[PDB]
């Protein structure tokens, strides 16, 4: 769901961003 995406999307983006 929208929440799931945000969680993962935010997790990935945030993570991927980190390194």
Tab-separated table of C-alpha atoms in Angstrom:
chain	number	residue	atom	x	y	z
A	1	UNK	CA	0.000	0.000	0.000
A	2	UNK	CA	0.925	3.683	-0.002
A	3	UNK	CA	2.394	3.207	3.467
A	4	UNK	CA	4.413	0.188	2.374
A	5	UNK	CA	5.892	2.127	-0.514
A	6	UNK	CA	6.769	5.068	1.671
A	7	UNK	CA	8.436	2.804	4.189
A	8	UNK	CA	10.441	0.924	1.592
A	9	UNK	CA	10.757	3.832	-0.780
A	10	UNK	CA	11.970	5.991	2.055
A	11	UNK	CA	14.144	3.209	3.379
A	12	UNK	CA	15.762	2.530	0.043
A	13	UNK	CA	16.107	6.117	-1.007
A	14	UNK	CA	17.507	6.995	2.359
A	15	UNK	CA	19.784	4.004	2.381
A	16	UNK	CA	20.816	4.208	-1.209
A	17	UNK	CA	21.545	7.806	-0.558
A	18	UNK	CA	23.745	7.043	2.366
A	19	UNK	CA	25.945	4.865	0.249
